[PDB]
Design a protein around this ligand. Sequence first.
Ligand code: HEM
Ligand code: HEM
Lengths: 145, 145
Amino acid sequence: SVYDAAAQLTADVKKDLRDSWKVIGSDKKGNGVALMTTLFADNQETIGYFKRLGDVSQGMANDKLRGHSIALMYALQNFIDQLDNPDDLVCVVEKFAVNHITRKISAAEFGKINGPIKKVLASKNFGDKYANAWAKLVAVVQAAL
Amino acid sequence: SVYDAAAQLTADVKKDLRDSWKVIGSDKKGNGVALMTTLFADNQETIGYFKRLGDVSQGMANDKLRGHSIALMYALQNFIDQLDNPDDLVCVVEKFAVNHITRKISAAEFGKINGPIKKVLASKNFGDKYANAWAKLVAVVQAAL
Ligand code: HEM
Ligand code: HEM
């Protein structure tokens, strides 16, 4: 269950999540867009899912892509803030899960976000340990898909 | 025009929005649910739009409503953080406007949230001055509907 996934997150993992988010979460517009464009660059097969945002190659100049990228970072902000209460993390994770379930996004496809995250983290010198911490948070969402 | 509405957010208004947000934003789960239940209580005709959340009369005991409510508070958090830049404020407002346009929510009905907000602020000792500042932020979203 999603609860099992959340309840598993340990103190050391929450620590790494919080420490890395302090940095990558401080520039939501910049890092959010970088996350999205990196996803499009390495997984071109996903572009079709974002037709609403228009031309995603426009990057920062694309207002729709900019608005989406910022809202995504607040969804992650929401997750980070709920870390100490599995009950709250679960209901927010499930809320956002529905947003992707309606778009027919499977658990496997959602996990494609791990690559971009690993790269953004690296650009700030957060190594594999931190990428693994984030893969665990992503897995919580996957448990709901 | 969403851009002209955003222009209505002067130095004084932005200050009042930030000061009051520091208090209400500190308990996103509690005040978020307070907002929603007050909306449903004083405007029963809107309950129908929220079919997905199930029985909203259960308030805090409804996991779907709680998740939704928290998420809503992070959307407000997003607006507050974008007050410095009118261009970013507009792209995020338009992002969430689309979420309501697809649900057939008009500018007039979206405005029904002003009542709940005034009440929640009042319960925290913030008067008409703050309720009116929030009415202006809400108006920016209305202009995009
Ligand atoms: C940590 C990673 C992710 C987070 C936190 C996240 C968050 C979000 C949020 C907040 C929305 C807006 C929901 C709405 O308003 O309807 C959204 C929409 C969407 N997401 Fe994700 N997402 C993530 C990863 C992904 C991945 C990997 C895919 C691709 C397979 C995906 C596909 C979509 C699609 C297609 C939309 C709809 C965009 C639109 O038309 O507006 N997401 N996501
Ligand atoms: C302070 C003003 C408001 C904010 C910031 C806000 C924010 C949000 C957010 C972030 C979502 C989730 C979007 C999604 O995932 O699809 C949402 C959904 C929704 N909102 Fe609002 N909202 C506000 C006021 C209202 C009002 C006044 C109404 C109706 C009279 C309304 C009707 C809806 C509906 C029907 C949904 C979809 C619920 C669902 O099926 O999950 N909203 N809102």
